[PDB]
Symmetry: C4
Subunit: 274 residues, 4 copies
């Protein structure tokens, strides 16, 4: 029993007049996978920002080296209404079982937040074989760094970007130091680090199009950064997607970008960590 | 070698003039599965009532929260005679191996009780590939609560009933408290309890026909019961059938009903247990 | 590379004039299986009698309840010569590895005993893919009860015999006492013993032809024997064949008979064991 | 993406004017398997001799009973240049992971040694699906018995040679002593030793052509050698190829010869070891 689900996008009014937030989507596995990623990074509390145009989940990883911004725009889901801008806090372990219980048989997820129950976030999963709606009442808080969202504004245009598959990235970083990323016109991308037993190891990408690399680096100006390999390896081990887009800045800042469906998964790792 | 077995039903006389009870049936696995159920409930002694029209096996589970009545009517088996009404006691561990030794190759089970051997119950299994009859002499006692059979008389007409599969019931009750069953005309069946980590969880059945639900509850009168979830979960873990029919009473009484073939398996869980 | 092997039988002269015994056969697995049987019975020394017409291997099992006579007649093998009647002793553990090394690729086994090497028994296995002959020099002794061979002479004609498969015999004896074998004209074969937890158990074979049973018991004279079930169960666990013929005597004596190919495997269990 | 690789052989000049050695080959698995063999023999340091015509890897096994000479001639690879005769030392554990990381997806291996980096040996592996070159900088030494290469000159013409598969050799030597190899015209090859429990065991090869045996032994002169079976068994357990050619000398010297592709793998075991 697979119904066809209309995609309505942002609505001007909610279906229930008491809803501060109404969300529904026909791919609930994005939420299961989002929360596997949070578990792998050992994020303890997930902060949520709801807005008339999108819902955003935020957390540092446990090491605090990296920050995750997961955004779902309302125009890309089946049903989205949010009255205004508000914030919620969700303890990750509390919702872990629920999100893990989703499988490929769940055809829908609905999330409701009502003015008259400000400490509750309702998650609704419908099974359409027998028409049973299953609801979880997840207690949430309001917590009122800050803006790393600037790093991923439409305009912050990074000079060096490419794409790895989960396989490629985990092969590269297979064997307590840094890895140098260096480029250049003709752009051989160079990656160098020390592998097992202090052996100097070098990868050279001769074809920018096979790894979908783009560069805005001026012809003869060199780009070289030194980033810590332990942070990269942990982000690789934690991936839930098949592909990441890596974006690099001259001061060493790194943005990892994965897309699931309506979900845009951004992981920022700035070079300011001691 | 599969013979065709005539179904004769209740006979007016036995084949052996000394038989107080003669039973035979062409689906011996019902007895294997009946006795797996008794083992799962850890019933220690199985009491038997034989009657000119049916044979009934009785026992409490080990917790005493539930009572099992398993009935096989003589009109539905291959061969049935009983001289009068009498009672026997069978120690479950004593017959456990025998009943577990049945498999899909057994085409017949015969049970004989003779006046001149009042402490013996004969079980006969025939293998028709080589025409060997194998007989067990099971020592039995006569023990002379009482009538919970009233709860399942033809007339005790419960206002709320539905059907779950083994899968559905075990999914519902997957994660030390009670579960509220509530209904209402339009009947959304509501089930609510606390799941992992004190999360309020709610199942709502919008289609009465997909779970084969029937209700005799008057239009606007509410039906709500509170029953202990530990007793339900143990009955679910113990099921040997694929489907149960759940019947509910306004005072919280519950009757679970499974059918194997000629065997009707009833499990009663009244709301009087402290 | 499978050659065709001529079956010559008993020859009047050996190929090598110094051979006291020359044997060869195109089914060496009979020897592997014979020696698995000896290992299962934990026979320590295997005695061998060689004769112008046949070779015989003899041993008690470790319990001494049973005696094994394994005979290979020279007329049924590819090549057989024996000068006269002589005896050899073979330590079983010494040859166990060799006999276990045979597999379905061995197409031939040759055994040679020469006058000038009276403490040596030569075993020769040929691999015809590359034409390599592999030879083992097995040191043997000469040891010069006695005649249980009388029990299995052509004339000792037992009143009750039948056949079980390995499966049937192991099912019958599946669960420290005796088993009664009883018969009778119309011959229902009856077997009775105590199964698990002192339950009296009875098997009745209504069709003599499905178990290939023959009886020479006079019409109305009863035949009943009591034999120890532990000895039977050990012979069943030790079988290397798919079928045994059971032969019974009125004093309780039992002969088990299996055939491999040219090998006749007899196991005698007389009722004189305390 | 499988390109076609030109085989150019020895070049008169290198592609990079600073190369003392340039090697490349389109079967990098020969190097993986060469280094599995060295690991199995527990060779600690691998010595390398580079020459305008070939590259040679040398090491004793850990027991020092055997010496390995692995030669790759430049005329048989895709690209080979060497300026002169020079020697390098490679610690085996240091390169073990790298060589083990090769799989059937590697289509190329390049090895470069440059005058201006005399302590470095560069290994380059190219992945042609995405055009990434991966390079390892392996630190090497220069170490400046000696000539066992004489044993395998074109002219040292051994009187007895044959071929075993890995399977055959490991079956022969399946079960602290010596094994005698003896021959003779008509050449039955005889092999004799003591197998399990002091049993004299003899293999006789009646067909010289099925094991590809050649002999230059004069008609009636006997050839017999006694070699230690422990050294043979260890070389068998260590094989990485499917076939070895065994060459024998009258003083007991043994040469084992395997070919991978361009790699000739020679293992010498002279009879001078105490």
């Amino acid at each position: 029993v697979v119904p066809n689900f209309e995609r309505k996008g942002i609505l001007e009014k909610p279906v229930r007049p008491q809803s501060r937030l109404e969300f529904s989507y026909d791919n609930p596995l994005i939420f299961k996978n989002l929360f596997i990623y949070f578990k792998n990074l050992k994020s303890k509390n997930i902060l949520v920002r709801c807005t008339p145009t999108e819902i955003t989940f935020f957390s540092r990883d446990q090491s605090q080296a990296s920050f995750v911004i997961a955004t779902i725009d309302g125009k890309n889901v089946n049903h989205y209404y949010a009255s205004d801008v508000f914030w919620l806090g969700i303890n990750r372990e509390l919702v872990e079982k629920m999100f893990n219980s989703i499988d490929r048989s769940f055809l829908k997820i609905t999330i409701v937040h009502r003015y008259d129950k400000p400490e509750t976030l309702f998650f609704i999963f419908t099974d359409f074989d027998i028409d049973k709606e299953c609801t979880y009442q997840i207690t949430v808080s309001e917590p009122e760094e800050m803006e790393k969202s600037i790093s991923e504004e439409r305009l912050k245009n990074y000079p060096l970007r490419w794409e790895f598959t989960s396989k490629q990235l985990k092969k590269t970083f297979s064997d307590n130091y840094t890895e140098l990323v260096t480029i250049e016109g003709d752009t051989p991308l160079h990656l160098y680090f020390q592998k097992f037993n202090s052996i100097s190891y070098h990868e050279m990408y001769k074809s920018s199009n096979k790894i979908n690399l783009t560069s805005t680096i001026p012809k003869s100006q060199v780009f070289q950064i030194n980033v810590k390999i332990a942070h990269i390896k942990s982000l690789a081990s934690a991936m839930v997607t098949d592909k990441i887009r890596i974006l690099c800045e001259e001061n060493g800042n790194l943005i990892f970008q994965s897309e699931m469906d309506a979900l845009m998964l951004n992981t920022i790792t700035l070079n300011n960590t001691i």
